[PDB]
Scaffold this active site. Structure first.
Site, PDB file in Angstrom:
ATOM      1  N   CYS A  27       8.060  44.544  64.603  1.00  0.00           N
ATOM      2  CA  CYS A  27       8.636  43.235  64.551  1.00  0.00           C
ATOM      3  C   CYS A  27       9.297  43.209  62.746  1.00  0.00           C
ATOM      4  O   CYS A  27       8.245  43.013  62.036  1.00  0.00           O
ATOM      5  CB  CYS A  27       7.930  42.253  64.843  1.00  0.00           C
ATOM      6  SG  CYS A  27       8.697  40.594  64.436  1.00  0.00           S
ATOM      7  N   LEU A  28      10.431  43.065  62.405  1.00  0.00           N
ATOM      8  CA  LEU A  28      10.814  43.082  61.347  1.00  0.00           C
ATOM      9  C   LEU A  28      10.812  41.479  60.978  1.00  0.00           C
ATOM     10  O   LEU A  28      10.778  41.240  59.972  1.00  0.00           O
ATOM     11  CB  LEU A  28      12.227  43.438  61.173  1.00  0.00           C
ATOM     12  CG  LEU A  28      13.487  42.854  61.845  1.00  0.00           C
ATOM     13  CD1 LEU A  28      13.928  41.545  61.450  1.00  0.00           C
ATOM     14  CD2 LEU A  28      14.415  43.837  62.121  1.00  0.00           C
TER      15      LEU A  28
HETATM   16  C1  HEM Z   1       4.794  35.220  67.112  1.00  0.00           C
HETATM   17  C2  HEM Z   1       6.190  35.688  66.610  1.00  0.00           C
HETATM   18  C3  HEM Z   1       6.671  37.149  67.000  1.00  0.00           C
HETATM   19  C4  HEM Z   1       6.187  38.004  67.857  1.00  0.00           C
HETATM   20  C5  HEM Z   1       4.636  38.291  68.521  1.00  0.00           C
HETATM   21  C6  HEM Z   1       7.108  39.156  67.838  1.00  0.00           C
HETATM   22  C7  HEM Z   1       6.906  40.357  68.761  1.00  0.00           C
HETATM   23  C8  HEM Z   1       7.832  41.481  68.450  1.00  0.00           C
HETATM   24  C9  HEM Z   1       7.537  42.592  68.923  1.00  0.00           C
HETATM   25  C10 HEM Z   1       6.525  43.227  69.731  1.00  0.00           C
HETATM   26  C11 HEM Z   1       8.476  43.595  68.600  1.00  0.00           C
HETATM   27  C12 HEM Z   1       8.952  45.036  68.876  1.00  0.00           C
HETATM   28  C13 HEM Z   1       9.542  45.364  70.348  1.00  0.00           C
HETATM   29  C14 HEM Z   1       9.626  46.953  70.530  1.00  0.00           C
HETATM   30  O1  HEM Z   1       9.315  47.590  69.741  1.00  0.00           O
HETATM   31  O2  HEM Z   1      10.338  46.940  71.748  1.00  0.00           O
HETATM   32  C15 HEM Z   1       9.608  42.656  67.957  1.00  0.00           C
HETATM   33  C16 HEM Z   1      10.695  42.895  67.422  1.00  0.00           C
HETATM   34  C17 HEM Z   1      11.716  42.298  66.664  1.00  0.00           C
HETATM   35  N1  HEM Z   1      11.682  41.000  66.367  1.00  0.00           N
HETATM   36 FE1  HEM Z   1       9.907  39.991  66.648  1.00  0.00          FE
HETATM   37  N2  HEM Z   1       8.280  38.814  67.096  1.00  0.00           N
HETATM   38  C18 HEM Z   1       8.061  37.580  66.647  1.00  0.00           C
HETATM   39  C19 HEM Z   1       8.796  36.957  65.614  1.00  0.00           C
HETATM   40  C20 HEM Z   1       9.930  37.255  65.260  1.00  0.00           C
HETATM   41  C21 HEM Z   1      10.566  36.408  64.190  1.00  0.00           C
HETATM   42  C22 HEM Z   1      10.479  35.155  63.678  1.00  0.00           C
HETATM   43  C23 HEM Z   1      11.888  36.941  63.862  1.00  0.00           C
HETATM   44  C24 HEM Z   1      13.057  36.595  62.968  1.00  0.00           C
HETATM   45  C25 HEM Z   1      14.064  37.281  62.629  1.00  0.00           C
HETATM   46  C26 HEM Z   1      12.058  38.502  64.750  1.00  0.00           C
HETATM   47  C27 HEM Z   1      12.900  39.249  64.966  1.00  0.00           C
HETATM   48  C28 HEM Z   1      12.711  40.488  65.717  1.00  0.00           C
HETATM   49  C29 HEM Z   1      13.795  41.485  65.714  1.00  0.00           C
HETATM   50  C30 HEM Z   1      15.055  41.411  64.844  1.00  0.00           C
HETATM   51  C31 HEM Z   1      13.143  42.781  66.345  1.00  0.00           C
HETATM   52  C32 HEM Z   1      13.917  44.023  66.618  1.00  0.00           C
HETATM   53  C33 HEM Z   1      13.102  45.149  65.528  1.00  0.00           C
HETATM   54  C34 HEM Z   1      13.714  46.547  65.789  1.00  0.00           C
HETATM   55  O3  HEM Z   1      14.134  46.802  66.833  1.00  0.00           O
HETATM   56  O4  HEM Z   1      13.664  47.425  64.790  1.00  0.00           O
HETATM   57  N3  HEM Z   1      10.836  38.210  65.616  1.00  0.00           N
HETATM   58  N4  HEM Z   1       9.075  41.456  67.638  1.00  0.00           N
END
Ligand code: HEM
Ligand SMILES: *[C@H]1CC(=O)N(CCCCCCN2C(=O)C[C@H](*)C2=O)C1=O
Ligand code: FES
Ligand SMILES: [Ca+2]
Lengths: 392, 106
Positions: free
Chosen positions: A335-336
């Site tokens: 997660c970025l």
């Molecule tokens: C408790 C809060 C959060 C959790 C548990 C979480 C969880 C995750 C996970 C597990 C992934 C990876 C999915 C994969 O590899 O298929 C991810 C990716 C991502 N998340 Fe978070 N996330 C959270 C909050 C946020 C926030 C605040 C943002 C604000 C920008 C965000 C933006 C993104 C984005 C843009 C990706 C795509 C990263 C990539 O594909 O390189 N997330 N998240």
């Protein structure tokens, strides 16, 4: 509604699991998924549900698969059903400029005030639907802050984001409306910049040249939407748990210095994301024969619930020694938004517990969990005696 | 247990770092912004690149094969004492270890 067993899948690996409607959902969604980790369940199973797919059930496999981008590709990360590494790296470099640790740290005071302003308007009422009254407006207001958007634009943005999660509008239509809101702002802030998220993205460089307005709006859209559902629902799991555990509440009140650590234990215990990868070629993985094109669910939520990784995994111990989880993911796509998410959680727990130290679930309320790619809480009615609160 | 981070511009950050925590993780937790740690510490990004001081380059367990492949992608100069600091886990025997931080991770 089940799919036929593929020739290469042995019967003893078949397991009845529907990630959108698991059997034991009423014990709680993390509990419903943990049936995948009962004592004689294989490390890797196959379900006939949702088109048919693999599920890795242990943190060891889940980590290994997410590290092996060569066999397990993110071209199709969702069940049921991109860009090259050089563009991917530049994409993450820019997102890190926007939402990286330096940005978060200097943003913290304004996040703290927002959290305070939100809770103070709730405190003297003695009740709320936490999900609707705090969990939802907090991260969307935090994004406006980060992106330098004016306060009067929220109900429109709130409306558009909900339609990507809910009304009367296609997903494609909702995405385009969100894009169409961003593009004029991007163009205005381009070349004639500030330090807000949108100015930074708009002035970013890709392959030696300016980021296009098209690339910019998608990046902006993605940073807005990616931080909504996960944060909204994680805060609700957390606040649901604290409402039921007066002793855990007291620990943080007496020792507010343990709140960052407590936050990490809540991230392990109430982990909520489950996506996956697709096999790029035939591959023998832990004694199991996977075929090219097979989808494999790699639930981020299950690593930290794995008893082989954390003793007594359903137990919440704020002094837990070695907290192991993959709640924000693992490998290159971790997660970025993790630093912003952590600060949002830590600020929320601190500003809430300071003002409203005592609360419970509303009498007779059935808290209903939902399961999916991002699991969540339908509603969270809380009640408290307003005379027992403290304005700050 | 103590760790010293020397920035490229000569700036010095002396840090108290608990045992079991990676040198990446302590840095990101403590305002050392010239270490990024984008992948979150699985040797998948090379944005936690540091140069381990010659006095400790043999006290630290050797880089495994995944770290070596990843190191080929550092954006700053790759040196014989280049390491990914997410792969360096703080131990009492490393007390006073000095690492120099490159001028760029991205
Ligand atoms: C408790 C809060 C959060 C959790 C548990 C979480 C969880 C995750 C996970 C597990 C992934 C990876 C999915 C994969 O590899 O298929 C991810 C990716 C991502 N998340 Fe978070 N996330 C959270 C909050 C946020 C926030 C605040 C943002 C604000 C920008 C965000 C933006 C993104 C984005 C843009 C990706 C795509 C990263 C990539 O594909 O390189 N997330 N998240
Ligand atoms: C999308 C998701 C993913 O994991 N991935 C591949 C990983 C890219 C980064 C590692 C590759 N690499 C090297 O082998 C050397 C340097 C470097 O960045 C996607 O494209
Ligand atoms: S943090 Fe990604 S390689 Fe060290
Ligand atoms: Ca349009």
């Amino acid at each position: 509604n089940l799919a036929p067993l593929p020739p290469h899948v042995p019967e003893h690996l078949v397991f009845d699991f529907d990630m959108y409607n698991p059997s034991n959902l009423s014990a709680g969604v993390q509990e419903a998924w943990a049936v995948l980790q009962e004592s004689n369940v294989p490390d890797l199973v196959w379900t006939r549900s949702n088109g048919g797919h693999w599920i890795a059930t242990r943190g060891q496999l889940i980590r290994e698969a997410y590290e092996d981008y060569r066999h397990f590709s993110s071209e199709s990360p969702f069940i049921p059903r991109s860009m090259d590494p050089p563009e991917q790296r530049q994409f993450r470099a820019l997102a890190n400029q926007v939402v990286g640790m330096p940005v978060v740290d200097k943003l913290e005071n304004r996040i703290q005030e927002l959290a305070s302003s939100l809770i103070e308007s709730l405190r003297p009422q003695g009740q709320c639907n936490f999900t609707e009254d705090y969990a939802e407006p907090f991260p969307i207001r935090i994004f406006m802050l980060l992106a330098g958007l004016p306060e009067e634009d929220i109900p429109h943005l709130k409306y558009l984001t909900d339609q990507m999660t809910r009304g009367s509008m296609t997903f494609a239509e909702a995405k385009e409306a969100l894009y169409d809101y961003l593009i004029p702002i991007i163009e205005q802030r381009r070349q004639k910049p500030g330090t807000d998220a949108i100015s930074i993205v708009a002035n970013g460089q890709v392959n030696g040249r300016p980021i296009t307005s098209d690339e910019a709006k998608r990046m902006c859209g993605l940073l807005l939407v990616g931080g909504l559902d996960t944060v909204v629902n994680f805060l609700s799991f957390s606040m649901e748990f604290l409402a039921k555990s007066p002793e855990h509440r007291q620990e943080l009140i007496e020792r507010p210095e343990r709140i960052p650590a407590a936050s990490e234990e809540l991230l392990r215990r109430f982990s909520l994301v489950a996506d996956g990868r697709i096999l790029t070629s035939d591959y023998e993985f832990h004694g199991v024969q996977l075929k090219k094109g097979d989808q494999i669910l790699l639930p981020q939520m299950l690593s930290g619930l794995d008893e082989r990784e954390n003793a007594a995994p359903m137990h919440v111990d704020f002094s837990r020694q070695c907290v192991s989880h993959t709640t924000f993911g693992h490998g290159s796509h971790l997660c970025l938004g993790q630093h912003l998410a952590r600060r949002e959680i830590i600020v929320t727990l601190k500003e809430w517990l300071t003002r409203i130290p005592d609360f419970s679930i509303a009498p007779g309320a059935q808290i209903q969990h939902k399961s999916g790619i991002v699991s969540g809480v339908q509603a969270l009615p809380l009640v408290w005696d307003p005379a027992t609160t403290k304005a700050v | 247990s103590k760790v010293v981070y020397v920035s490229h511009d000569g700036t010095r950050r002396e840090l108290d770092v608990a045992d079991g925590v990676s040198l990446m993780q302590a840095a990101v937790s403590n305002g050392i912004y010239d270490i990024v740690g984008d992948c979150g510490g699985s040797a998948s990004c090379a944005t936690c690149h540091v140069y381990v001081n010659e006095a400790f380059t043999d006290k630290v367990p050797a880089a495994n094969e995944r770290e070596i492949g990843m190191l080929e992608c550092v954006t700053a100069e790759l040196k014989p004492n280049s390491r990914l600091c997410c792969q360096i886990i703080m131990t009492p025997e490393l007390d006073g270890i000095v690492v120099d931080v490159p001028d760029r991770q991205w």
